[PDB]
């Protein structure tokens, strides 16, 4: 995943109340230019969604799963072909599971202590969450003591401030409702807007 | 003897929009392995289109070599003519076949509201077909097993 | 003996809009020669319209003289009455015939969204029918051969 | 083809993503007054299109194929009934193949050297391509040293300057998107506009 | 070189009357964001320049040489570490030499015939030259018959129309005086302007 985050600079985060909904959004998002897609594991039958969207892998899509809180959930995300696992928090059992399986893992943090625990376990790319609390200021401040740490914030990110997040030093930004909510045609247009805005900064 | 026989499943698939129709078939086959546990095995046959499925599927069903048959196709409005006449004949055809042969025929013949072969539409259907494949595999195992309980 | 027999194919074609219906038939015959390699030969029969195809085609299919039958017609909205009732009966008719005789019946009966017999429309359909003829020939050879594999 | 180019002064160049699309455009173009139609060989299943449109031959259509880069492609264009073959460039293997088959061949050129090589091989009618680079000025300049050479430019041709191309001495003009793109009804109207504009000059 | 052209979309073309001049420009250009640098072989003591600038390879610079008209010149460009060789014209001896040495070669063309000869020899990336004559229109026109051919035009390229060249389908653009002429500080600013303008389109 390291190359991919650098290459695309954006991850779509999907939420849906159904399999069909998750697919329509994934396609609108993908069709609109976002290649890295995170499926929250909490989508009813997310496992179906993760596996069904494996068809987009041959078109250059990268399909993974988020909101993973346990190893049992990880196992299913892996079973369905998740490229990566993202947790709300750093979790040692998730991390060890992921290392054994060979699936990329990104733990969540909010403070230097949490950041460091993740560094000490070999994770130099962190989910910053909520980005709504810490902001681009946190990301920039962290570069002093942790110049080798990359972030992918979730929340607090929109097309209005995505460039601030990049000026601060993020690796990529995760984008939620601002990118994925609305009619699939609206979603596709939003994906183009996010890609173009990031392209320019 | 003890029944440890593999249940044979046939899949009959249309060659039109094969990229999509095959998404279903591939997902189906994978799901049959995941669910069946090698208690089931599947053979796949090609058919020019949805129209001929009821006879091909029947020729096969009446052979006695299969426990069940899955027919599949993507039937669309080409913008030239009404496709509903065939779609109607085909769904009724498959219904009549299972009622004439005693071999359940599953339907994975889709008649979408809209398909203009746009980038988004193609991608949407590849994924939706993969889902239908997985659903059909589950339906296959459950219906076959359910009729065995009568 | 060794099977070097010619497969006999029948074509049953409606006389309405013959200029268009025959475009399909001519293309079909040419394509059968191109694909068949003289392994196939085709006889053509006329029928007043699409409506009678299921009985004419069946009379012929039940004779055992043909490996397969292609029915064809151009069924249009005359602006006077609804043509859908016949088109439905005909497609269902042909479906029932192949399911009653064991002889595949291909459908090249078209029900266009719009046809006002304008210059452009006539020309469009002559070309589209020629395409359908070529497709049907391919379908014919492939389905006939495919059923032989069961 | 020599009589036909002189008679009609225009060749439609078709491009399509399908057989049905190619047919609808061919019919709109033909119905609108353009009799000489070139089907790019790159249309998916162009062979089907070329053969299916043979029905228009009895209505006075002339059906050929363009963008031919090889003899294998030529063979199929011939197999399907192409009246003529047009290549992006002068190609000796295409030319010899065409001579043996009796199918009219028009090689592409951009410079006097290329022009001359074609003349030395017996081809006095050339595809001028891109017309976007050389213009009507090239066509006129060539008449000095090559008074017996006829051109059919492709590209750089629209109804806005078609008469300039004729003042320069072209034989006929090939027309691309300006003639064949849009709704088949729009295409038919465009064909009428091109025929009438040429009729007047 | 295939990845690099796609990655950077720009090649600086250097000309100098001295070794020191070539170095100052290469550094201003590189420092300003242009990684692919072509040194014309005609720089007095170009061989010294090519070899001296090998130090920038560890900083991510790609150093090659242009205006190569012969195999003897190629040999020296290779001896000095050129990553690639660019000729003013397609030349079979240069091409064969380059294949034997394993150095990337980009031949120059202006017409479909020349384009095709290069394709038939295995070269799908061409120098388009002068771009001043053929323009973005040529590049776009060529995609019809040659959808798999990539161009890197030289001449006719400035920051005013670089996006037109990209809309037309070029792979990368070579840039001459517009990028490399002036005081090394001016050169560095120009490099930033070209990179940013391309970044945005």
Residue numbers in the entry:
A (entry chain A), D (entry chain A), E (entry chain A): 691 to 891
B (entry chain B), C (entry chain B): 6 to 155
Sentences from the paper on this structure:
Here we describe the computational design, production, and in vitro properties of self-assembling, two-component NP immunogens that present native-like SOSIP trimers of several genotypes. We recently reported the computational design of self-assembling protein NPs constructed from two distinct oligomeric protein components. This property makes it possible to express and purify each component separately; when mixed, they assemble efficiently into highly ordered, homogenous icosahedral particles ranging from 24 to 40 nm in diameter. We used several techniques to show that we have produced monodisperse, icosahedral NPs that assemble in vitro and present 20 native-like SOSIP trimers in a well-ordered geometrical structure.
To generate building blocks capable of displaying native-like Env trimers, we computationally docked the crystal structure of BG505 SOSIP.66434 to a set of trimeric NP components with exterior-facing N termini. An early screen for the expression of several of our designed nanoparticle components fused to BG505 SOSIP revealed that the trimeric component of the recently described NP I53-5030, designated I53-50A, secreted at higher levels than any other scaffold when fused to BG505 SOSIP. To further assess assembly efficiency and structural integrity, we performed single-particle cryo-EM analysis on BG505 SOSIP-I53-50NPs. After several rounds of two-dimensional (2D) and three-dimensional (3D) classification, a final set of ~3600 projections was retained and reconstructed with icosahedral symmetry to a global resolution of ~4.5 Å as determined by Fourier shell correlation. However, because of flexibility in the linker between the two domains, the SOSIP trimers are poorly resolved; they appear only as diffuse densities surrounding the well-resolved I53-50NP core. Two discrete unfolding events were apparent in the thermal melting profiles for BG505 SOSIP-I53-50NPs; the SOSIP trimer components unfolded at a lower temperature than the I53-50NP core (72.5 vs. 82.0 °C, respectively). Specifically, the stoichiometric values for PGT145, PGT151, and 3BNC117 Fabs, close to 1, 2, and 3 per trimer, respectively, confirmed that the SOSIP-I53-50NPs present 20 antigenically intact trimers per particle. Finally, we also observed a markedly lower binding of BG505 SOSIP-I53-50NP than their corresponding trimers to BG505-specific mAbs targeting the immunodominant 241/289 glycan hole (RM19P, RM19A1, RM20F; Cottrell et al., manuscription in preparation) and trimer base (12N). Thus, bNAb epitopes on the SOSIP-I53-50NPs from the apex down to the CD4bs are highly accessible for multivalent interactions, but this is not the case for some epitopes further down the trimer near gp41 and epitopes at the trimer base.
